[PDB]
Amino acid sequence: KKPHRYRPGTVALREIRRYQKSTELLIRKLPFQRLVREIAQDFKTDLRFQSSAVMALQEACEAYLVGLFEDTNLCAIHAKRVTIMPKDIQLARRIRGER
Amino acid sequence: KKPHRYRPGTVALREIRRYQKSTELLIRKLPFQRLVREIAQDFKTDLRFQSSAVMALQEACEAYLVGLFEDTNLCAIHAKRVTIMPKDIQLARRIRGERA
Amino acid sequence: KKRKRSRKESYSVYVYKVLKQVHPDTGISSKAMGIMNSFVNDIFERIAGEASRLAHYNKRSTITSREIQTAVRLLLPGELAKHAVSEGTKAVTKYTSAK
Amino acid sequence: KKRKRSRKESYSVYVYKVLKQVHPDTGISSKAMGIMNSFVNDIFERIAGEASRLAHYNKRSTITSREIQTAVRLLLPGELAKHAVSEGTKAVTKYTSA
Amino acid sequence: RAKAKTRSSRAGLQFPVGRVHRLLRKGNYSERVGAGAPVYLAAVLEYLTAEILELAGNAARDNKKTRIIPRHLQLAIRNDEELNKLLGRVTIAQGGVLPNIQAVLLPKKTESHHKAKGK
Amino acid sequence: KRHRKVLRDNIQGITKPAIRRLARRGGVKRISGLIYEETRGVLKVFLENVIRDAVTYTEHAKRKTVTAMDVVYALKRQGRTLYGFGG
Amino acid sequence: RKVLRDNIQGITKPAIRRLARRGGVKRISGLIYEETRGVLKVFLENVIRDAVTYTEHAKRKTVTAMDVVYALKRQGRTLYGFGG
Amino acid sequence: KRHRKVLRDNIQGITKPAIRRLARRGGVKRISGLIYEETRGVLKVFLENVIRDAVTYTEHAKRKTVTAMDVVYALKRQGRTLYGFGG
DNA sequence: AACCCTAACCCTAACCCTAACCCTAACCCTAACCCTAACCCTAACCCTAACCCTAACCCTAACCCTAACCCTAACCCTAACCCTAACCCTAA
DNA sequence: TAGGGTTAGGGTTAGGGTTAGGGTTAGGGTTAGGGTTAGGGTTAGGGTTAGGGTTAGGGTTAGGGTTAGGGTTAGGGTTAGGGTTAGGGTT
C-alpha cells in the first residue's frame, strides 16, 4: 500500500506552475455559448450570434476574471492570511473604481 | 488643575467633522508657488506662469491626495488597524493602476 | 483703440432661463455659471464624438437624428437616457408636424 | 466568382518586409499577423487623433509636420520618444532633398 | 427676410438650435450635418441642465441660502446614482467632500479601556 | 417545439473546477468555499454590459446578427481593447 | 524661482495632516509624512511637463490656465471650472 | 410546431382601457396619464405573492398541477378569503 | 528511499507557403489656383519684482494612554484519492 | 443524431491555518509657550501679446497613364502526437 498523499497545499504549487505556462481557455465552450444566449434574450429576441462573437466574449471574460484574482490575492497577503475569501473581492472592486 | 484634558480620540473626531464641511484650500499658496516653479526650470528655462494656472494646479494636487487617503483608510481597516501606515499607500496605488 | 474687441461666445443666457422655469426665486453666482458652461461643453463633445464614429463604421456620410440618438442610448446611463430619448422625440415631432 | 467582392486593405505585406530586415530567418503565423496588423491600426488613431485637437485649440486649419511631432512627444512614453522623434525627422529631411 | 422666427422657437426648445448647427459643422465632426440633428441635440442638453439646476436649488433651501454656489453643485451630483456614474471622474472647482466617517472608528464603540485593571 | 428546459443556462458551466482553474492561473493557493457564488455574480454584471452595447450597435445597422467586429467595438468603449479576435 | 529643498518642505507636516483629515483618517503614523511628499512630486512632474508641450506649440512663453485644463483632461481627471 | 414560449410582454397585456374600466367601478372620474404604468406595478407584485405560496403547497404533494383548492388555501393566509371558486 | 515524477526523441504529416499569375484598382505626373502662414509696428496690460508688516501658524518639547505585535493553544474547514457515468465534443 | 471518453461529481480525513485571548512597550495624542513667514497692501517698469495689411509658396484638384497590391493554389517544412527512453526527488 502506497498512499503517497502529498501534504495539503503542495499539489497546487505544481498546478500553478503548469497552468501559468499555457494559453488554452479554461471554461467549456458549449455551456458558455448558452450563458450569452440567455443574457441576450432580454435586450432583443431573434438575435443570431456568429461563431466569432462567442469566441471574443470568452477571451475578454476570462481576462477580466484572471485579473480580479491576482488583485484579490494581493489584498489577502496584506492581512497576513494566505487564502482568498468573499470579503477580499469587494475591497478590490471599490479601489479599482468599478463599484 | 482639573481641566478638560480630552482623552486620545476626541479632538480628532471633531476635526474630521469641521474639515469635511468646508470648501477652502488646505495647502498655503506661497509655498506651492515655489514647488511648481522648481519642477518647471528643468523642462524649459524662463517659463512665466499665469496667476490662474498656479491655482488650477493646487486644486488638482489637493484633490488627488484627498483621494489616495480615502483608499488608504479602506485598506488599513481590512487588517484590523485604525492607523494609516506607509505599507498601505503603496498597496492602494498598485490595485488602482498607477505605479505598477 | 476703436472696436478691436473679440466676442467670447458662451451658453450663459440659456442657463439663466432654465433656472427661471424649474425654480423661479433663485439665482446663480458667477462661479456656478463657470461650472455649468463647462458642463454643456462636455456633454456636447461626448455625443458628437460617438456619432462621428458610428457614421464612419457603417460607411455613411451624414449625422441624421438616428445617429445622435444611438449615442444617448450608449453614453448616458439608465433613468437618464430613458427620460431623454422621449424628450427629443416630442421636440423633433413638433418641428416636422407643426410649421 | 461573379460576386465582385469589394475586398479589404491590410498593412500585412509591409509587416513581412520589416520582419526580414531585423531578423533574416524567422517567420510569422497568421494569428500573429492579426495582433500586429491591429497594433499598426491602433497607433494610427491615437497619434493622428491628438493632432486633430491640437489644430483646433490653436485655431490653425491644417495638420502639418510640427503637429505630428507634438503628438509623439505626448502619447509615447520616455525613451521610445527620443528615439522616434529623432528617427522621423531624418526621413522628412531625405524627402525634401529628393 | 420677410419676418424673423427663431429656429429654437418653432420647436419650442429654450437651448439654442441655431448655434449647435454651426458648432457641429465647423468642428469637422462629419461632412453633412443633416437637419434633424441640431434639434435633437439641443433637447438632450436642456433636459440635463434642468436636472442639475433643480436638484441643486433644492439643496440650497435646505442650507438656507438663495444662490446655487459651487458646493451646492457637488451635493447634487455626488448623491444621485445616475448623475454620479456619468460625472464620476470630474472634479468641481471648490466643491469640498460629502460627509462620511466609517463606523468602526466612531468614538469608543469597542471602548478604549484596554488592560482595564480589575475585570 | 421547445427544449423542455428554458433556464437558458442560469450562470451555469462555471463549475467549481473552472473557477479553481482560472484562480490558479492568477496565483491563488487556498480558494475559500463562499467564492464560487460571488464569482458567478461578477461574471454576470460583465457579460451583460458588453452585450447591451453590442446589441445597440447591431440595431443601428438594422441587421439581426451580432458579428464580432460589434463586440470589439463595444469592448473599446468600456476600457479594454481586445486585439485581433475580430480585427 | 528657487532650486533648493523648500519646494517639497513647503508641504509642511500640519498641512499634510489636514488634507488627510478631510478624508476620514483618525491616526497617522510618523512615516506617512515622508511618503506623501514623494507622491505629490511625481504627480506635479507629469501634469507640468504636458502643459509645457502645448505651450511650445504656439511659441508662447506663458503657461496659461487653459493648457493645464487640457493637460489634466488627457490623463483621465477632467477639471471643470478654472477654465472653459 | 409550437416553436415559441411565453415572453415577458404579458405585463403590458393589461390594456389602457381595462385599467379605465376597473377604475370607473371604483368611483374614479378623471384618471391621470401616468397611472397606467403604476397599476401594472401593483398587480405585478400581487400575482407573484399568491403564486409563490400556491406552488409551495403543490410541491408538498409532489404533484405537477396547481388545482384551485391550492389558490384558495394560499389566499386565506395572505389576508383575503375567496368564498366560492373552491370548497 | 516509502517509491513517486521530469526530459531525450521522431515520426508525423497540415498549414505556412513562394510563386505565379493575372488584373483590378488605386497612385502619380502634369497641368490649373488661392490663400494663408509668414510679415510688422504698436499700444496695451499684466506678470515680475521690490518693500513693509504683523499676527495667525508652525516648531519644539513633555507626559502618558492606547493600540500594534507576539506569543499562546485549538478546532473548525479546506485540502487530496476514487468509482463513476454524464455530458461535451467530434464528425457528418 | 450516435457515441465515447473524460470531466465533473460525489464521498472521506487529517492537517494547518484562522481566530480568539492575554500580556508588553513604544508611539501617537494632547496641551503649552517661543519665534516667525506668509499672507495682505502699494508702485513701476519691463515683458509678452493683439490685430492688421501683405506676399508667395504650399496646398488642392481634375485630367491622363500604370504600378502595385489583393485574391487563389500545390507540396514541402515545421510541428505537434506518440510512444519509448530519459530526467527531476517527494510524499
Side-chain angles (χ1 to χ4, degrees):
Chain A
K1 172 72 221 111
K2 8 247 127 17
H4 227 294
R5 299 266 317 225
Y6 298 94
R7 287 171 40 186
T10 70
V11 175
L13 199 78
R14 174 164 44 191
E15 225 165 345
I16 293 180
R17 295 187 287 105
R18 185 189 67 178
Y19 271 102
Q20 268 175 329
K21 303 219 311 292
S22 61
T23 61
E24 41 84 24
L25 319 175
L26 310 178
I27 325 178
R28 323 250 57 90
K29 337 284 185 56
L30 242 311
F32 196 95
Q33 181 139 171
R34 280 175 289 105
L35 180 54
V36 321
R37 292 179 183 271
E38 168 208 334
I39 293 178
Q41 185 238 174
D42 314 330
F43 304 106
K44 222 240 141 302
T45 190
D46 316 310
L47 278 198
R48 273 202 168 275
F49 277 120
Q50 273 203 0
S51 153
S52 201
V54 303
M55 285 301 304
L57 279 167
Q58 200 167 331
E59 254 294 337
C61 302
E62 151 200 336
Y64 175 55
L65 289 181
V66 169
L68 178 64
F69 282 111
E70 191 187 14
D71 296 339
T72 316
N73 175 249
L74 194 44
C75 280
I77 319 294
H78 186 228
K80 298 114 45 211
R81 199 192 319 164
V82 89
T83 150
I84 76 172
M85 271 195 59
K87 9 179 304 183
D88 313 322
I89 296 201
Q90 305 150 182
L91 181 60
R93 314 226 326 278
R94 224 97 296 179
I95 288 209
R96 278 154 139 259
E98 320 190 24
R99 189 164 281 98
Chain B
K1 34 161 164 41
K2 318 129 247 333
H4 233 213
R5 203 88 185 199
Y6 288 122
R7 293 221 264 119
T10 59
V11 213
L13 261 140
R14 293 186 318 183
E15 244 145 48
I16 305 175
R17 305 183 212 271
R18 190 208 322 174
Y19 288 108
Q20 245 178 337
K21 252 162 273 300
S22 296
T23 35
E24 304 175 4
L25 304 173
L26 311 174
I27 301 187
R28 296 276 93 185
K29 305 108 192 67
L30 250 307
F32 205 75
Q33 208 168 357
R34 314 188 293 256
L35 181 55
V36 176
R37 291 175 190 263
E38 298 199 14
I39 302 187
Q41 282 163 357
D42 327 334
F43 303 123
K44 181 180 178 181
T45 32
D46 195 28
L47 263 191
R48 291 150 35 89
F49 282 96
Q50 255 203 218
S51 326
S52 35
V54 79
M55 228 154 53
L57 266 163
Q58 195 185 1
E59 312 236 20
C61 300
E62 275 187 8
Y64 155 77
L65 287 190
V66 195
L68 252 188
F69 286 144
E70 290 169 350
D71 299 345
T72 321
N73 217 238
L74 288 184
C75 272
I77 231 165
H78 187 71
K80 294 283 90 77
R81 267 187 281 104
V82 77
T83 153
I84 63 170
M85 272 175 170
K87 335 141 40 195
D88 300 316
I89 292 195
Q90 299 164 359
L91 178 61
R93 292 191 43 116
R94 301 265 275 111
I95 307 175
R96 237 151 139 264
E98 221 103 300
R99 77 168 41 179
Chain C
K1 308 178 305 178
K2 313 302 173 182
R3 200 92 59 89
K4 256 80 76 186
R5 184 67 191 97
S6 177
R7 294 294 199 89
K8 271 68 167 54
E9 308 164 18
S10 47
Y11 305 75
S12 153
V13 208
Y14 315 107
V15 195
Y16 204 20
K17 298 183 183 315
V18 194
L19 187 61
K20 288 314 162 58
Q21 301 178 0
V22 305
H23 265 290
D25 287 357
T26 44
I28 262 188
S29 60
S30 152
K31 315 294 179 175
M33 216 85 266
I35 321 178
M36 278 298 303
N37 169 230
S38 294
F39 168 93
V40 165
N41 275 313
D42 196 46
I43 328 271
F44 160 53
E45 244 116 25
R46 272 198 255 173
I47 319 195
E50 185 63 41
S52 170
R53 299 212 244 100
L54 256 161
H56 276 87
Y57 288 162
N58 299 8
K59 224 82 63 183
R60 275 171 49 260
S61 193
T62 285
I63 356 180
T64 87
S65 217
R66 193 165 86 264
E67 272 105 36
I68 316 264
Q69 171 187 321
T70 306
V72 175
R73 291 209 295 153
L74 290 157
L75 146 84
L76 263 50
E79 210 176 355
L80 203 51
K82 301 178 178 57
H83 304 323
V85 166
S86 100
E87 174 97 6
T89 38
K90 51 180 286 293
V92 275
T93 290
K94 294 186 176 188
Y95 183 28
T96 60
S97 299
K99 300 300 297 186
Chain D
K1 304 155 62 189
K2 204 167 187 170
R3 331 141 317 191
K4 293 119 181 175
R5 282 194 302 103
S6 304
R7 289 185 285 103
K8 297 295 166 300
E9 296 192 8
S10 324
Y11 301 90
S12 168
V13 186
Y14 315 110
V15 158
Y16 220 102
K17 315 227 209 78
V18 172
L19 174 60
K20 286 316 164 57
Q21 160 194 351
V22 282
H23 279 274
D25 69 306
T26 47
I28 259 197
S29 43
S30 180
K31 318 204 70 56
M33 200 70 71
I35 302 157
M36 283 295 306
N37 183 20
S38 294
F39 160 99
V40 168
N41 234 325
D42 178 67
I43 319 278
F44 170 79
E45 296 284 340
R46 263 182 279 192
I47 300 193
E50 165 84 355
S52 173
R53 304 173 203 102
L54 247 161
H56 286 146
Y57 301 142
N58 309 331
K59 281 161 165 291
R60 257 65 158 88
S61 51
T62 172
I63 18 188
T64 70
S65 175
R66 35 168 9 188
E67 337 245 347
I68 323 201
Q69 188 200 153
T70 299
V72 172
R73 278 208 298 176
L74 283 186
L75 298 155
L76 284 196
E79 250 252 0
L80 231 275
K82 194 171 62 66
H83 283 212
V85 166
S86 85
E87 208 254 22
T89 44
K90 221 167 308 183
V92 155
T93 289
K94 284 172 40 62
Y95 175 88
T96 309
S97 291
Chain E
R1 91 276 263 265
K3 54 105 208 60
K5 184 174 305 177
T6 145
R7 280 158 47 99
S8 78
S9 177
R10 38 84 173 153
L13 285 176
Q14 310 293 310
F15 249 67
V17 193
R19 293 255 243 89
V20 181
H21 199 232
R22 161 174 53 94
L23 303 177
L24 244 96
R25 186 160 45 92
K26 281 193 168 51
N28 258 331
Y29 301 90
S30 187
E31 262 279 21
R32 310 181 63 255
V33 188
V39 194
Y40 201 123
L41 192 59
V44 272
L45 287 173
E46 172 187 310
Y47 168 64
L48 284 154
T49 285
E51 187 122 344
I52 311 189
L53 267 198
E54 104 163 74
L55 300 176
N58 280 359
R61 287 151 18 187
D62 298 7
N63 167 18
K64 284 174 288 182
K65 297 186 196 308
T66 47
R67 248 91 141 284
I68 313 193
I69 58 171
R71 160 87 156 171
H72 299 165
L73 289 165
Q74 179 138 204
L75 303 174
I77 324 175
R78 247 50 163 179
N79 275 330
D80 202 5
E81 266 313 299
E82 327 291 356
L83 270 166
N84 194 38
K85 276 150 42 186
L86 176 72
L87 305 183
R89 286 269 182 263
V90 168
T91 306
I92 311 292
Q94 301 188 207
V97 267
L98 233 73
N100 198 185
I101 311 182
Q102 289 273 323
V104 191
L105 49 114
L106 273 195
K108 252 50 88 247
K109 185 150 312 204
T110 99
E111 262 84 72
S112 46
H113 303 326
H114 195 240
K115 293 130 143 174
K117 280 310 186 186
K119 202 174 177 297
Chain F
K1 29 190 174 179
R2 263 301 171 175
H3 278 296
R4 9 86 56 175
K5 278 183 176 180
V6 293
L7 86 171
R8 284 273 86 260
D9 183 90
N10 35 27
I11 333 180
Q12 217 61 42
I14 348 173
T15 57
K16 282 184 175 55
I19 322 178
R20 291 175 102 258
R21 269 148 34 170
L22 292 167
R24 301 202 185 275
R25 181 102 58 102
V28 174
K29 196 256 290 297
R30 232 172 78 95
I31 320 183
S32 284
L34 319 174
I35 292 280
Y36 312 110
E37 50 205 26
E38 188 129 20
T39 307
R40 290 166 213 173
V42 311
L43 172 65
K44 177 62 175 53
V45 291
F46 184 42
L47 241 175
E48 256 255 351
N49 264 355
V50 194
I51 287 182
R52 193 176 304 182
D53 315 335
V55 178
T56 304
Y57 288 95
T58 74
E59 291 181 346
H60 188 262
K62 287 180 295 90
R63 303 179 302 103
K64 301 157 54 181
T65 58
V66 209
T67 62
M69 270 280 251
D70 304 333
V71 151
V72 307
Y73 285 149
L75 272 167
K76 168 144 62 173
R77 277 196 24 90
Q78 293 196 8
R80 12 198 69 90
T81 330
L82 179 62
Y83 265 3
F85 240 165
Chain G
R1 277 153 179 162
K2 292 179 179 179
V3 228
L4 313 165
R5 253 306 228 84
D6 18 67
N7 60 101
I8 214 34
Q9 284 316 296
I11 337 284
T12 38
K13 173 163 48 188
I16 218 137
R17 220 159 38 182
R18 294 174 316 187
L19 272 171
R21 290 204 202 278
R22 201 200 277 267
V25 178
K26 180 182 167 187
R27 273 170 58 102
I28 307 212
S29 176
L31 302 102
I32 280 303
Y33 312 119
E34 190 56 37
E35 239 259 10
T36 186
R37 293 169 193 273
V39 178
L40 175 90
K41 227 183 69 62
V42 175
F43 190 41
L44 279 147
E45 286 191 3
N46 296 0
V47 185
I48 307 170
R49 165 204 314 178
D50 307 348
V52 171
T53 286
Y54 293 102
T55 240
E56 289 170 9
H57 209 57
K59 279 101 63 175
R60 299 197 319 266
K61 313 171 195 57
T62 313
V63 194
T64 64
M66 274 260 252
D67 303 341
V68 158
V69 179
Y70 297 144
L72 291 163
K73 198 182 76 169
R74 248 183 34 82
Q75 316 169 2
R77 318 223 116 261
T78 319
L79 186 79
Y80 272 12
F82 281 110
Chain H
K1 307 187 65 182
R2 185 205 45 93
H3 215 296
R4 213 85 299 188
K5 74 164 182 305
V6 213
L7 249 283
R8 316 151 288 111
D9 187 33
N10 308 134
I11 335 163
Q12 297 94 217
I14 276 62
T15 74
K16 302 164 72 275
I19 31 204
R20 300 178 91 255
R21 63 174 94 264
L22 281 170
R24 298 197 186 274
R25 180 177 286 187
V28 171
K29 177 199 190 68
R30 283 260 313 269
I31 319 184
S32 167
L34 313 94
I35 272 300
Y36 311 121
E37 270 301 328
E38 260 264 18
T39 68
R40 268 121 73 186
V42 176
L43 171 71
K44 185 55 166 45
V45 186
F46 182 42
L47 242 188
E48 306 156 323
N49 273 2
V50 284
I51 283 298
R52 182 192 297 105
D53 315 336
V55 178
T56 42
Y57 286 96
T58 310
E59 293 179 345
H60 187 90
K62 291 153 44 262
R63 291 154 49 256
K64 294 101 123 299
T65 180
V66 206
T67 54
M69 279 278 283
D70 302 348
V71 156
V72 181
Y73 282 157
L75 269 163
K76 170 183 295 186
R77 281 191 22 89
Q78 195 204 200
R80 354 252 124 219
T81 320
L82 186 69
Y83 271 6
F85 280 144

